[PDB]
Amino acid sequence: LRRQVDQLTNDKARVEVERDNLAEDIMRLREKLQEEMLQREEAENTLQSFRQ
């Protein structure tokens, strides 16, 4: 039973870290891409008052 545990949980942990890298890169890219929004989406519609 516990030998089925060691071989099952670890090939799953290999497939899970093959996805945890994507979810760390998207969470890192959220923080950055929101810092990009914090300047770009203020400027965007603010400068449309001036487009007029």
Partner: protein, 52 residues
Amino acid sequence: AKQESTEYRRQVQSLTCEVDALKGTNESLERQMREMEENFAVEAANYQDTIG
């Protein structure tokens, strides 16, 4: 000279938000490094206790 001082004011305001967002991205990497580093310290302690 007032129109040039108003165009350089837009360049100031845009470049401020751009470098504030790149600084906010570097602080976001600093914070993601902490939340991975808090896991690495806990994984090291759990591994060493499990072995001993």
